[PDB]
């Protein structure tokens, strides 16, 4: 079935202005400080062009030139609501995107002249970093997500439409990241930021937040959003990025987010005041559940960021946000989501994305074919860049395979390169890897083809191959802590698999194909198609395994191994009752 398909690029960063006006219409709106304008597509999603927005649409008096206001129908006038990410305004529509706009007053009223400097400051301004307006409870009331960086997300909240408004009594937060080991430093300190809000089929409300911890927080509210259970960790991992959920015309859900692990704090890092650098911005993921969210499937990439690999990814306007982070959709037919994500302008797509490729069960890559599309192999120079960047190289290039033929395989290896270390920070990264993405699933099948090099090797050079639950960094070598499953392919003494106890030998100068079949907390490892030995589940996971990471081993320069071919197919593990 499909793959995602990038049709555009937003011109401003995702999570706010993406609105369809018609069946055939759908718009983005932008942050420019200029005439108001939005880019617009009338086939439904497929090709899109820039409009000037027409004069009574107001311009942007708050936010800020990389977002666009949030815009929003109300689903019992069919008007629409917009706010600001910050600053500015609350404006309705009266006949609406290109009808009457009037801005809501600060005792409850609406005001048509607002290109009134001076009748604007009786204007309600609703504070905080504000995300999207929702409409609950059908339709009687919309709240508003907002925060403050240290204290945490509550809501602004209208129940007539957005003309008066209170907030709620609580929220959600998030605790302080802690520097254990392998961090060297503090995490920037965010308080359950960011929320996303979705109304369940009961009436509940689930708040989805951004965190300073390993995976996005989580509330709960019973009564429309006035009052928040105690916060707790969410299923969806991912640090100091955005998540977003919506509904389905049919009810499933949907959530995207950004599935990755950092690379861990370094010894420059602080304490919570100011982040260091981003290593997890350069892919966005989907998954679904049709069952209120008590199951889940896909956790698919939808993209990995085409500059990831660049030594030239931070150059340019240094001090802005770049990657595929933060998210907003709209279901263009049964099967077809479009997708705004991402930040920066060369960075920012929109994506058409089909829930039959997110419901698939198998997937399969050749590294010299798709290492461009589906791989991500990037180290970083650890130097700071901009505002909070890293420019980055490949960690691993693909040569000849030596068997012949034309194919291509990729090489990772423990390197020689002085750019990729700084002994102040204290982080080292000199060792290639590889890691892909598959269809989660809590059983499955993963097969690769392997290769020793035929070169000098380190004492300890080797491959540590792991099962994980996000996308870790190529360079990352703790991702084995963090693993579901996890052992070592090692080239001395001789080659072997370490399988806990036991040692595997194998040949050099020939191809291997090693198969990991999990399910609960045991994966059977076979070599060559006769089993090799069993490992036990190093880390529990909430969803299962959603990738394979391939990382060198050696602490010296090394001619390391090759990779291949490499294949998944994961089953549904479906409810029943006799447990
Ligand atoms: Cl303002
Ligand atoms: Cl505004
Ligand atoms: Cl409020
Ligand atoms: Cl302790
Ligand atoms: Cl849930
Ligand atoms: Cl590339
Ligand atoms: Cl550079
Ligand atoms: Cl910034
Ligand atoms: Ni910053």
Same mark, same amino acid.
């Given at each position: 079935?499909?793959?995602?398909?990038?049709?555009?690029?937003?011109?401003?960063?995702?999570?706010?202005?993406?609105?369809?006006?018609?069946?055939?219409?759908?718009?983005?709106?932008?942050?420019?400080?200029?005439?108001?304008?939005?880019?617009?597509?009338?086939?439904?999603?497929?090709?899109?062009?820039?409009?000037?927005?027409?004069?009574?649409?107001?311009?942007?008096?708050?936010?800020?030139?990389? +977002?666009?206001?949030?815009?929003?129908?109300?689903?019992l006038?069919?008007?629409?609501?917009?706010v600001?990410?910050?600053?500015?305004?609350?404006?309705?529509?009266?006949?609406?995107?290109?009808?009457?706009?009037?801005?809501?007053?600060?005792?409850?009223?609406?005001?048509?002249?607002?290109?009134?400097?001076?009748?604007?400051?009786?204007?309600?301004?609703?504070?905080?970093?504000?995300?999207?307006?929702?409409?609950?409870?059908?339709?009687?009331?919309?709240?508003?997500?907002?925060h403050?960086?240290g204290?945490?997300?509550?809501?602004?909240?209208?129940?007539?439409?957005?003309?008066?408004?209170?907030?709620?009594?609580?929220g959600?937060?998030?605790?302080?990241?802690?520097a254990?080991?392998?961090?060297?430093?503090?995490?920037?300190?965010?308080?359950?930021?960011?929320? =996303?809000?979705?109304?369940?089929?009961?009436?509940?409300?689930?708040?989805?937040?951004?965190?300073?911890?390993? %995976?996005?927080w989580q509330?709960?509210?019973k009564?429309?959003?006035?009052?928040?259970?105690?916060?707790?960790?969410?299923?969806?991992?991912?640090?100091? =990025?955005?998540?977003?959920?919506?509904?389905?015309?049919?009810?499933?859900?949907?959530?995207?987010?950004?599935?990755? #692990?950092?690379?861990?704090?370094?010894?420059?890092?602080?304490?919570?005041?100011? +982040?260091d650098?981003?290593?997890?911005?350069?892919?966005?993921?989907?998954?679904?559940?049709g069952?209120?969210?008590? =199951?889940?499937?896909?956790?698919?990439?939808?993209?990995?960021?085409?500059?990831?690999?660049?030594?030239?990814?931070?150059?340019?306007?240094?001090?802005?946000?770049?990657?595929?982070?933060?998210?907003? #959709?709209? %279901?263009?037919?049964?099967?077809?989501?479009?997708?705004?994500?991402?930040?920066?302008?060369?960075?920012?797509?929109?994506?058409?994305?089909?829930?039959?490729?997110?419901?698939?069960?198998?997937?399969?890559?050749?590294?010299?074919?798709?290492?461009?599309? %589906?791989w991500?192999?990037?180290?970083?120079?650890?130097?700071?860049?901009?505002?909070?960047?890293?420019?980055?190289?490949?960690?691993?290039?693909?040569?000849?395979?030596?068997?012949?033929?034309?194919?291509?395989?990729?090489?990772?290896?423990?390197?020689?390169?002085?750019?990729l270390?700084? +002994?102040?920070?204290?982080?080292?990264?000199?060792?290639?890897?590889?890691?892909?993405?598959?269809?989660?699933?809590? =059983?499955?099948?993963?097969?690769?083809?392997?290769?020793?090099?035929?070169?000098?090797?380190?004492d300890?050079?080797?491959?540590?191959?792991?099962?994980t639950?996000?996308?870790?960094?190529?360079?990352?070598?703790?991702?084995?802590?963090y693993?579901?499953?996890?052992?070592?392919?090692?080239?001395?003494?001789?080659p072997?698999?370490?399988?806990? #106890?036991?040692?595997?030998?194998?040949?050099?100068?020939?191809?291997?194909?090693?198969?990991?079949?999990?399910?609960?907390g045991?994966?059977?490892?076979?070599?060559?198609?006769?089993?090799?030995?069993?490992?036990?589940?190093?880390?529990?996971?909430?969803?299962?395994?959603?990738?394979?990471?391939?990382?060198?081993?050696?602490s010296?320069?090394?001619?390391?191994?090759?990779?291949?071919?490499?294949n998944?197919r994961?089953?549904?593990?479906?409810?029943?009752?006799?447990?």
């Amino acid at each position: 079935v499909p793959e995602p398909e990038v049709v555009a690029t937003p011109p401003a960063d995702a999570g706010r202005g993406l609105i369809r006006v018609d069946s055939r219409e759908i718009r983005h709106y932008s942050g420019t400080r200029k005439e108001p304008d939005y880019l617009v597509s009338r086939d439904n999603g497929k090709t899109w062009e820039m409009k000037a927005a027409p004069a009574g649409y107001p311009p942007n008096y708050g936010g800020i030139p990389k +977002e666009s206001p949030a815009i929003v129908r109300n689903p019992l006038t069919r008007e629409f609501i917009r706010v600001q990410p910050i600053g500015g305004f609350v404006f309705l529509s009266r006949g609406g995107l290109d009808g009457k706009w009037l801005a809501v007053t600060n005792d409850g009223k609406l005001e048509e002249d607002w290109k009134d400097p001076e009748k604007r400051k009786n204007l309600k301004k609703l504070g905080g970093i504000m995300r999207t307006p929702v409409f609950v409870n059908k339709g009687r009331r919309v709240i508003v997500p907002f925060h403050n960086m240290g204290g945490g997300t509550k809501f602004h909240i209208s129940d007539d439409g957005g003309l008066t408004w209170h907030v709620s009594r609580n929220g959600v937060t998030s605790p302080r990241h802690e520097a254990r080991p392998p961090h060297q430093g503090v995490r920037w300190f965010n308080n359950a930021v960011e929320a =996303t809000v979705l109304e369940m089929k009961d009436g509940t409300l689930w708040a989805l937040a951004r965190t300073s911890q390993d %995976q996005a927080w989580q509330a709960f509210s019973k009564d429309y959003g006035e009052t928040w259970s105690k916060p707790e960790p969410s299923r969806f991992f991912g640090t100091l =990025t955005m998540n977003t959920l919506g509904r389905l015309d049919d009810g499933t859900i949907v959530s995207l987010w950004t599935n990755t #692990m950092a690379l861990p704090e370094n010894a420059t890092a602080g304490n919570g005041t100011w +982040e260091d650098v981003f290593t997890n911005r350069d892919s966005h993921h989907i998954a679904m559940s049709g069952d209120e969210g008590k =199951t889940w499937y896909g956790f698919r990439e939808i993209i990995l960021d085409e500059h990831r690999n660049h030594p030239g990814y931070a150059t340019l306007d240094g001090p802005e946000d770049r990657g595929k982070a933060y998210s907003e #959709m709209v %279901q263009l037919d049964k099967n077809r989501i479009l997708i705004s994500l991402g930040q920066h302008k060369n960075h920012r797509r929109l994506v058409i994305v089909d829930r039959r490729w997110v419901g698939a069960k198998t997937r399969a890559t050749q590294t010299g074919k798709d290492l461009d599309s %589906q791989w991500t192999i990037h180290t970083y120079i650890p130097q700071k860049k901009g505002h909070c960047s890293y420019n980055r190289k490949p960690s691993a290039e693909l040569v000849q395979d030596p068997s012949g033929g034309t194919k291509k395989v990729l090489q990772i290896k423990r390197l020689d390169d002085p750019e990729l270390v700084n +002994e102040k920070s204290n982080v080292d990264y000199r060792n290639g890897g590889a890691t892909w993405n598959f269809p989660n699933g809590t =059983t499955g099948l993963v097969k690769f083809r392997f290769r020793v090099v035929d070169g000098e090797q380190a004492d300890d050079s080797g491959l540590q191959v792991s099962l994980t639950d996000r996308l870790f960094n190529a360079c990352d070598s703790t991702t084995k802590d963090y693993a579901l499953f996890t052992f070592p392919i090692r080239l001395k003494p001789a080659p072997h698999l370490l399988l806990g #106890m036991k040692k595997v030998p194998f040949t050099p100068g020939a191809w291997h194909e090693i198969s990991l079949l999990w399910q609960g907390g045991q994966a059977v490892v076979s070599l060559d198609g006769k089993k090799a030995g069993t490992l036990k589940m190093a880390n529990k996971s909430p969803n299962g395994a959603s990738y394979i990471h391939f990382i060198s081993t050696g602490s010296q320069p090394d001619a390391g191994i090759l990779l291949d071919t490499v294949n998944a197919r994961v089953k549904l593990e479906h409810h029943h009752h006799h447990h």
